[PDB]
Design a protein around this nucleic acid. Sequence first.
DNA 1: TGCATCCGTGAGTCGAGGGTAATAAGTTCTCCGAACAAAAAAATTCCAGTCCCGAAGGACTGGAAGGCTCAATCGATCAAATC
Lengths: 79, 51, 308, 85
Amino acid sequence: ARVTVQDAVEKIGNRFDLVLVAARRARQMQVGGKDPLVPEENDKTTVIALREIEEGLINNQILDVRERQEQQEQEAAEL
Amino acid sequence: REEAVVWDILDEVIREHPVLLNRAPTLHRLGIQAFEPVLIEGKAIQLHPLV
Amino acid sequence: TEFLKPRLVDIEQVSSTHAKVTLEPLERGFGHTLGNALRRILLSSMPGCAVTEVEIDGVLHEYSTKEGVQEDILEILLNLKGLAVRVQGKDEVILTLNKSGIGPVTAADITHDGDVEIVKPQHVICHLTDENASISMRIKVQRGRGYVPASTRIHSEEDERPIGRLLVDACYSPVERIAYNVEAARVEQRTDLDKLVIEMETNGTIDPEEAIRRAATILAEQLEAFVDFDPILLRPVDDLELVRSANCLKAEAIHYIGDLVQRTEVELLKTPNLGKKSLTEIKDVLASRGLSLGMRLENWPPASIADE
Amino acid sequence: ATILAEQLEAFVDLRDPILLRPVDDLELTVRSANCLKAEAIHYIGDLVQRTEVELLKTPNLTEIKDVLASRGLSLGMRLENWPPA
DNA sequence: TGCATCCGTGAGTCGAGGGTAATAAGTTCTCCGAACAAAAAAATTCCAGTCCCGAAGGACTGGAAGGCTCAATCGATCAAATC
């Protein structure tokens, strides 16, 4: 969170993928125009993403499902 | 011109914005550690007593 | 002299015996001052009633033991210190404590009257081990402020008390532990001033916010000899839940509320469709919608114009 | 004590843009801007200070009845306590 | 096998202030070349000049459509009465 990253690497298990699951995650509010799922708490998005992980709703896999289903709502939408 | 809103736009930004502090010679891996600022008014840098 | 008086912003109360009462801002040199200048009150000078004297039958001193009791006499003396009480109108009350049964002796066991107020009835004073023995003691309550332990109390009580009468370190003040701090506070150019943060936890028999009212009076009383848009408002007169305010406005080329508010009700009512009863159906409209007699409209007409 | 006994009182008590818009914003017709500058009106609040009757005496009403009905204006509206500088 | 040779090394920054100085020819003689000059376009800036649905605007013609006085005589209002 604001001070440490222990309680999120208890979930992720690595000191670099917690950066990498949030390097992927924390662009969607800078230029992606989206909103988080937790209470915002006036936070900069490099910890808003860290909040979403350490609230147990995000690992690397569950990010990969919302990025798949976005593409199959543009694929037949053209046709 | 050091105008009025200039501080309170900066004051929003440096909240939850990390920063580095490095001392040469950075003789081991803990010679460069990240920090988070809390802005004082002055001309020098105040450090935590256990770093 | 244009001093920066504060406003109290907040109490952060945890439970019914605890609070953190912050503040901002003060000047430098009064934040350290007040946060100490109240702490000399809440230690020594807050008036309350406490347990003072202890009388148990069949005792000689507290170094001794009592069979049928789990604990020592000192640990039973310890409990009456952690016991909370409130004598309302009197100035010296004595109570009694008699039990039987296998188990603890909670604070319901005191034979009270209506002027002595225990806040914590679950407070254990003794434990009976087996059914045989029993506790039968008498305790005494006195009024004062601060704290006096039984060391210097017997230096100030020169009574040759008979054997069997005990005396505890009285807890007159209600404050259990308070602390305070000073962080920095900002006025939008001067980031030099100091906030006041006070942490406070007291016993029962009080509100944790009532003390800072009560005790800061007493320091001050010492000083008195020293200071001496709407949706249907986008909608014509036929659809506003009314019917003698609808059919007779559109025949002056005002088909809507628009030029109704600019034009004067001495002529719009003088036209041969309204009159002296329409003001109940225009001015009551202008009560809820706020518009005036002659008002300039910000954005009235859209592209749509129609009728019925 | 006058300083101290007043800081206890926190404790012994407490626990239209359109109106100012000038003449050239309308991209208005070259014939009528030859006339509104001949009728000596500075702001649009000075124009609606006059009425529609106070414009007809100049040579060389449907245009203003087209454009005023779009952006939220009319004619004939009286102003008081004007100007506010 | 030394004996003798030589290549290739040595914590990290703030700085604090800027760069010298040795002697060295001449003659005529002559094409390569400059920017100022000084024309010769060509490009714009200017200035009146004919066209054309509109251009501020007045008027017109045309059907339609309009407000409120009375007075014979109807019917019912008012007010005593009265079952």
